[PDB]
Symmetry: C4
């Protein structure tokens, strides 16, 4: 019974580590192989290692375990020429990106079918958006019929317009299907997470009964309504913390408040509204190309690097604006005659006659010039302010290009590199120090495959998760002494039963 037996180590009343054996049913291990729960697990370890909250690590692990229980129970419910180059480039890009009662029963079966393949639905939506964007590359504009008129250039196939129309139709349909699948699959997970957070806060902190909700807490203030609900716990296990009559209005608006406040739900709603707007104008479908950035981990890291140092970037942009304003002040006061940008002398284009123009001209040209503001303005040849302009142009070029723009670029690059290094450090910590007790890697490295054996069966996270399922399923009376102790102390919400400092090998190294 190698795959039906699980080994876990807990510290008991004896103040020493003790390994116990519990039966693992095939159903519990079967649900662990779903890609969704595996991705959630990887996200959990990534987040906890990045945060570094060792003190609250056990609480986060327990929350992750409860989230896994909810995910697998949900899965149980849902269980049954130039165009040639353009085509080549699109194919190359796609490739990597690639890499009564009976009516109610039918409706819930269709909803479960939609929930079963939701990532596949998102992939199909991405493919439809990519195809639509590729089709849009053939658009042409001309005054003559096929004001400005946008038409399609005559292609060899000739089926371009009906193909685009059909692709837009299935794109809208698949966006609706994806939002329905998300509402029926991942929305209950966040609903249960918020209900558990509220229940724990009310039970162990008195957030409402023993204290005020507080200030600057939208979630806390909004959560005020759930308490009076006849069903405050609906997606959380602890339930003791005719369709119109059964539905409770306050619970419905509360739950809706949870959904529309979710980031993923908001993103999917934005996708749906962009798909709807794409019918008014086909060029609106280009907004769906951003799903490549979110889907790819590297592109997501690139996007997050911009907001990683948002405060510092904003401060640097403000400093650059102040510096450019000072230089514009100096130019307006002393160097107005050098800002003529018209070749013809009949109508000179004075760019520094007004301060806003001198400011807009500076901010648009000097920053992007790469050699300073002196390149655009007239060269100081024979002027009485020759040394003064030369100094002005050298100082502007230096202080802007070599410092201000360089600082911003270095900040963005450093944020991206820091995020990549954080991911690499998370991976190295996971493959070096085990998650359960975090003992040194060399101690197990002395024994051949010591760390592999320590993580596979001795301190496997899946083993503890399956132990939690087994404790939940098994009755209190049938629990053994160690099982009863661990269950009673788990209901106490105090996690010192983990191996913590040491394991079985360290305790009895001489015996082993």
């Amino acid at each position: 019974f190698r795959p039906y037996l699980g080994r876990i180590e807990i510290m008991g009343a004896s103040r020493r580590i003790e390994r116990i054996y519990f039966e693992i049913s095939e159903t519990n291990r079967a649900q662990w192989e779903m890609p969704q729960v595996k991705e959630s697990k990887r996200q959990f370890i990534f987040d906890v290692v990045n945060e570094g909250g060792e003190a609250e690590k056990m609480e986060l692990f327990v929350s992750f375990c409860e989230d896994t229980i909810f995910e697998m129970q949900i899965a149980a419910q849902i269980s049954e020429t130039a165009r040639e180059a353009a085509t080549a480039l699109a194919a190359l890009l796609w490739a990597v990106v690639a890499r009564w009662g009976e009516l109610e029963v039918q409706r819930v079966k269709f909803l479960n079918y939609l929930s079963r393949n939701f990532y596949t639905l998102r992939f199909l939506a991405l493919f439809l958006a990519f195809a639509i964007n590729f089709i849009l590359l053939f658009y042409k504009v001309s005054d003559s019929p096929p004001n400005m008129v946008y038409y399609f250039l005559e292609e060899s196939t000739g089926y371009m317009e009906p193909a685009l129309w059909c692709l837009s139709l299935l794109h809208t349909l698949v966006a609706f299907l994806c939002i329905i699948g998300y509402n029926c699959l991942k929305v209950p997970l966040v609903i249960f997470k918020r209900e558990k957070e509220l229940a724990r806060k009310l039970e162990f902190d008195g957030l409402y009964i023993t204290e005020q909700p507080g200030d600057d807490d939208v979630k806390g203030q909004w959560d005020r309504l759930v308490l009076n609900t006849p069903s405050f716990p609906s997606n959380y296990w602890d339930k003791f913390v005719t369709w119109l009559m059964s539905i409770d209005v306050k619970y419905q608006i509360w739950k809706f408040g949870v959904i529309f406040t979710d980031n993923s739900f908001l993103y999917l709603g934005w996708y749906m509204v962009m798909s709807l707007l794409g019918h008014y104008n086909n060029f609106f479908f280009a907004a769906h190309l951003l799903d490549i950035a979110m889907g790819v981990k590297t592109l997501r890291t690139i996007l997050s690097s911009v907001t990683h140092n948002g405060k510092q970037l904003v401060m640097t942009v403000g400093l650059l604006a102040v510096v450019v304003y000072l230089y514009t002040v100096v130019a307006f006061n002393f160097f107005r005659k050098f800002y003529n940008k018209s070749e013809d002398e009949d109508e000179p284009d004075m760019k520094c006659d007004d301060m806003m123009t001198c400011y807009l001209f500076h901010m648009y040209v000097g920053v992007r010039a790469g050699g300073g503001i002196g390149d655009e303005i007239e060269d100081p040849a024979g002027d009485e302010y020759e040394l003064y302009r030369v100094v002005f142009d050298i100082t502007f070029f230096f202080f802007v290009i070599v410092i201000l723009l360089a600082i911003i670029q270095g900040l963005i690059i450093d944020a991206f590199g820091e995020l990549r290094d954080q991911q690499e450090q998370v991976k190295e910590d996971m493959e070096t120090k085990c998650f359960i007790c975090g003992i040194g890697s060399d101690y197990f490295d002395t024994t051949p495959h010591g760390f592999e054996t320590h993580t596979l069966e001795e301190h496997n996270l899946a083993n503890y998760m399956f132990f939690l399922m087994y404790l939940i399923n098994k009755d209190e009376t049938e629990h053994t002494g160690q099982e009863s102790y661990v269950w009673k102390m788990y209901q106490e919400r105090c996690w010192d039963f983990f191996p913590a400092g040491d394991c079985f090998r360290k305790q009895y190294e001489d015996q082993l």
Copy 2:
């Protein structure tokens, strides 16, 4: 009595750590919550961790404690279209930047009121300067009446000029109020710091009595006058180290010498003189925009990065100047005919006929070109020196752009990154190793919330500060044995009473 009881650990005559309990009055803990003293505290730990002076760490801590006593006693005395885009950008910028006897009594009350809100006064001055600068963006120039004449463009509101005049008036008034508040609030702090430094030097080093003041010490030489003063100690506690008759002239000029030598006082005087000059010309108010750079920590770090490697930057600039001079020598000797910058052949603009022109032209164009001096000068097509110019232009472009400018930019970026890393390391050390004894983080990390308990009550800096207040207030006779010992050895100015290597937990780990 949880908040009225303080626990501190000191090493006594028994050569072992010993925790003692002292009563904490509510008044002492109340004054600790002022933002000014908290900011001074953060600055103190930042400076001491950056310096790394572990040997003199206790002396710096004692000096900080005395400065806190003086700060809280002072607080006790003072205790009672295009314009739409421009508006949007200004609002966004501002946002972050933001985020007889009776007469004498009235005068001192007004002065205390000014001192109470000094940071708020500085914020109001910054807002006034920002508003004035925003107003100045609408300035326009034209020969015709509203020589060159500067007038205001016709705006929709039409209240622009009176608003600017009033804003300048309140800007000058608030600058005067801010300088008065600084003179009445922070000037006594630096006065007391200098008086304590002088007293300690005279008592424990014989800087004047037992030795010469020295050379290249402006502060030491100037401090010569305070000694003869009938009031050498005026803002320092150790006093034993009719208005015209009461005031001592020598003390007055000495104190004034302290004030005008202060960096912050000099900066505020520069602000005041710029505000005064702004009435002569409204464009002079742009100098006040630099307060954004000083106020923001990131912008202050950016400014300090320039001067962090000032010597290396100056040496690199000198090397670049020497290289450009050598290239100018070569061009003047061999490549004079290639420096014609006039399209019309009637009046050629020979830029290398004179060595200073060839030098000024090189230093202005070749550095900022980004592709070398060869871009500006005529291309060597068919010339007898084709290979020689090509080599000259390649060598110039390489040695300047790829090396000299790159070295300067990398030096600035490295200075900025080093300052940011120093701040991050200071923060990590503060949140990892406690300031009092500096024991390892893992030792307390073995016990859950061990470091938090160790820093909150076991080795709290505020606890030692409150103990110092309690010792100062309590009489010598009422002092206990440990209190008398610590007071007598504090008057000895020798700080080995700190826990130093170990604490209570390490000493009696088995018992605990």
Copy 3:
């Protein structure tokens, strides 16, 4: 007998380290000095240290030892004006780069002669290619005889064309000789490596007998034919795992499948086909200049840096393409009139009338401009969309130049630096921690020249290799107890006989 005596340390049945002495013949040590085996050794340590496979380190060492045995047995079988500047540059470059039965007997002697000097043959081929490329620099084109006609400019020597023809002839001949030498020298090595891998897999894993070959394994599926061969082991020692009749067809096609799947053989075949194509057009010889990149370690690292982050680079390129497509969409929808690139107004060159042109124009100009797409397009002077274009051009310039291109350049630079740092770390580990037991450097550093003595004789890799040769040559009956034990346990393919944790010095430090 200093050079004829070898000392090695092994752990035996006594569970303690034990050094034994074995006779080293001069023949075994003589073959160790060949540059080929030394380069293979350096590559082996570099690869194993870079991989970091400590658990499989001993298996890799045993494989390297077997490869060395095969290499030395193979060696036993084969044992017996502007042109002046161009010339100066070519010489400087080359320098650094520089740095019946009797018939069968004659044929095998010629083949052995070719195999003896193969690196020299490659160097001669590189010299011939460099000379041909230098000759090609004098090519000129003109319509007139010596359609477009390519001829040779009249040189002072006048022997240019016959020299080029002869150089091409010997280049083709030396390419053929090099491919023959590689087939007769290094092809048997890879053949033996694949045969040993197959034998080990079949013996210890049941890859075919006890299991399926698997999926996505071209080598495993192709290796299916060798099994039925009457000679499955031909270049592997374990042989028990009329020319037409002797040759086995299945073995011949299997072996050929091994050769044409080799990277080095494929590269040499590409070299040969390029040499053959160079006769059709002499400009095809420029492909042979890539051998400089492969030959030089620094240039090879530079090339490998591009593919080190290939996935991230592809993702970044895709993100850049998506961003440029979005900007092209915006320009086509709103800023079509600003894309006129024709000076003459009679025939405007509308670059954004068609979406593909606007996309191709963007991807070709905006990326390489360095200041954004605004430089190429007309300046927005007086247009109703002045603020909108300014924002468009600033956002494009920022998001492309400062982020997208900077990220790609930083990724390439970081990959190159990471490869260089990996090589430096491999070297530091080799010169700091010995390969055999990996004890600390300081422990031997306490004793003067402790590490040198520990690596020269105590734990020399060459010593273990020579011990392996001595065990192979010596009969089983004549083996000593330790030798018999090590041989029997080596046939068990379990490598715990290495010193592993400790050596002789650590075991008996007090005695020593």
Copy 4:
């Protein structure tokens, strides 16, 4: 007798550390304060810490001690508008840069006077060169009298030409004086160093008597003549390893061979020859401006960064040349018509008609363009090879600008940063781990000012140096037991008498 007493720690026959006291004469400590010996000391520690030769550290220290003895004995023998901006810039630059028998007796006194102030003489030479270069900035050229004629522009002072002539005269005179001072001051030091190296090699290695001098050793082969000299040891202490008659010819040419092979002597000879050439043409004095680069440590590091990665830089330049040659091949074969650089169509300037022109044009324009070769060549508008040129220009721009030039710039920047980090690490090691025994910093940091006391008197390098002087001066008979033992074992040239692992504090920590 605090400054006349020295404490050193040595390990004796008892195998334990033992501190002994020796009398320090005032003369020995007086000579230690010369700036020359201090700079030599700093250079010695910098070099030894950078090298990391712990095994040979004691030998290097002994060599440094002997060099100090020779330096102090030598000192004993020698002991007795636009021009306004240009002036401001020159002053600012200079500032930082700033920061019978009786006849023989007179000649040797003059030589000693020259040797006494040699750094001052070099500073005066640098000032003269800077003044001459500043004067040269006023040169002007014109056809008319004051072929091309170089004259001086009319200045306000009018004394420019005689001042320049006099400055050149004293520059030549001071260069001669500096070379004489170097010959009489530092040349004997290198002579003694080479004589000691030869003596040690002959005594302890048999470089000539017991073996051949070797190959690729210019110093070893040249040193062959000194052996037969009647005075092989002339500047080395171990002398037992009529002017025309006294001088030995072979020794004279040998010594001259030592001098002209020295780097500093060669640099000073180059300075002298440049000064001599400056009289023929005053513009030749610009070569002396390089002394700023050598004098300043930062500028010297900048110069050394170029040659730090010389091999890698050469390989990268060769790879860039090969890539540019391949691109030129492609352009010549397919894109010849796009290389017209003449605005007038009457005489097109075909830049790719000849391969060398296409190669020279590519290497001069594409590298320095910053946007690729596509900017200079005609835009592909409507051509049949539109996609092919676009791909060609994108690939060229990427592979050159983003990779090849970026790699070179990053290599130079990394070399400079590595040199700066090496200097910083040397400083940190010196201020953290003492040079003598290298014990941990924390061990002495436990005791207040423990490291300061450990380095000032316990393990002072100057203390060991003064002990060496005292042993040299004191007779063998008067030596004490420890002194006799250390002297006899120093003549054995084996340095295990250093404290090495531990010191007095570690040996008797309980007693202390």
